[PDB]
Amino acid sequence: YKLICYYTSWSQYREGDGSCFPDAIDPFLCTHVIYSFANISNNEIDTWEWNDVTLYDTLNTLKNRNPNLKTLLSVGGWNYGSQRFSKIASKTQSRRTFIKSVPPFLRTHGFDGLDLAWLWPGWRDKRHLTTLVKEMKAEFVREAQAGTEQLLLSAAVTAGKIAIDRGYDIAQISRHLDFISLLTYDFHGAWRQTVGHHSPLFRGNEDASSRFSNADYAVSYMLRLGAPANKLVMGIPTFGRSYTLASSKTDVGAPISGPGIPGRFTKWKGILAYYEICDFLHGATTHRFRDQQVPYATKGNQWVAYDDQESVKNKARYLKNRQLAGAMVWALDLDDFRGTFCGQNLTFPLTSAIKDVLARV
Ligand SMILES: *[C@@H]1O[C@H](CO)[C@@H](O[C@@H]2O[C@H](CO)[C@@H](O[C@H]3O[C@H](CO[C@H]4O[C@H](CO)[C@@H](O)[C@H](O)[C@@H]4O)[C@@H](O)[C@H](O[C@H]4O[C@H](CO)[C@@H](O)[C@H](O)[C@@H]4O)[C@@H]3O)[C@H](O)[C@H]2NC(C)=O)[C@H](O)[C@H]1NC(C)=O
């Protein structure tokens, strides 16, 4: 059972206790930790932040304490243009230059593999992603002839049905990747002028135009498209999404005015860390969608959709019974990593809760 965990660069800037460094990570917690995000420059992989070299270094020391722990570097991200990626992939003289630069960069900084986070390929891009993945794995295989352990190659693949069909040749790229992580936590957002959950586990016989909007369907679809179970990994969020209510309506369907106010530490409209959520929960109204099996809370004119220990453990049994490769967690820095905000004295409450399910029968 794999446990892929993401650590984000920009989390170091958060003030006070918000501050997170590779330091805070417990070496036995996950199986793979992925540094997010690298940058591309002069058609070559390159760092992003100024002090990345230092952080790459800090993160890869964890391996001193745990030899079986593998790390990967992710290229892409949202704040990276899909356009830019699209440009390097369609012109063979740019693609090859990009591909050739990776083994060397990873080896230098002590990474065990590369994670492709192209968000998102357009209908014109599908053919070029397959090529990138194909040639990139070919290069990794050729490099192993030098007597070193073959690099891993993974991909972050979005979970909305329409998104998938547009730009991913699932059957094709699955034979080349080592694992695929399904972003099963972006099923709703402020862009829909109503209140709703972004990571429901099941459909819930309530509404029926978006039956493709839940983890369960996404997983089944991917399996039908040809991805082997032993390579699929399900995404579990550690954050929640917030919304400013536009009325006094709190139930399903309720009207929205826009995203929620920023968190004291994460400072971002519409997002909240689990540890910020734990604070918000005090004097908040406790609610839970029984059909879909995820919780939401509301206080004043704020409405928050999030995941707690019970829902996360529930998602974990699901991937187990369906026999998937494992779980992916976005992101370690949004969990209560110090273990002092969510009552119980436990660091990484959410991620450990997952591990507990994955670690038993
Ligand atoms: C991730 O990598 C990205 C890709 O490199 C980084 O993007 C860089 O962004 C900067 C600022 O946003 C851009 O800025 C430069 O603006 C002009 C743009 O013209 C150029 O880019 C062409 C791309 O190939 C080159 O062919 C040209 O030579 C030219 O550089 C630059 O020219 C400016 O500076 C330089 O200009 C001349 C070049 O002859 C020199 O004489 C100067 O002394 C100076 O060196 C700016 O640097 C840039 O487009 C862009 N990409 C590149 C190739 O660097 C991005 O910053 C990074 N992300 C983060 C946040 O780290």
From Swiss-Prot:
Region (Important for AKT1 activation and IL8 production): 302-316
GO molecular function, one term: chitin binding
Glycosylated residues (UniProt): N39
Keyword annotations from UniProtKB, A to Z: Antimicrobial, Apoptosis, Cytoplasm, Disulfide bond, Endoplasmic reticulum, Glycoprotein, Inflammatory response, Lectin, Secreted, Signal
Domain GH18: 1-361
Cysteines engaged in disulfide bonds, as pairs: C5-C30, C278-C342
Coiled coil: none
Gene Ontology CC annotations of this record: cytoplasm; endoplasmic reticulum; extracellular space; perinuclear region of cytoplasm
Expression by tissue: Detected in mammary gland.
Residues binding chitin: E49, W50, G76, G77, W78, N79, W120, L183, T184, Y185, D186, R241, W330
Location(s) in or outside the cell: Secreted, Extracellular space; Cytoplasm; Cytoplasm, Perinuclear region; Endoplasmic reticulum
InterPro entries found in the cross-reference section: Chitinase_II/V-like_cat, Chitinase_insertion_sf, Glyco_hydro18_cat, Glycoside_hydrolase_SF, Glycosyl_Hydrlase_18
A Gene Ontology biological process term: positive regulation of interleukin-8 production
Physiological role: Carbohydrate-binding lectin with a preference for chitin. Has no chitinase activity. May play a role in tissue remodeling and in the capacity of cells to respond to and cope with changes in their environment. Plays a role in T-helper cell type 2 (Th2) inflammatory response and IL-13-induced inflammation, regulating allergen sensitization, inflammatory cell apoptosis, dendritic cell accumulation and M2 macrophage differentiation. Facilitates invasion of pathogenic enteric bacteria into colonic mucosa and lymphoid organs.
Family stated for the protein in its record: Belongs to the glycosyl hydrolase 18 family.
Assembly and binders: Monomer.
Protein name, entry field: Chitinase-3-like protein 1
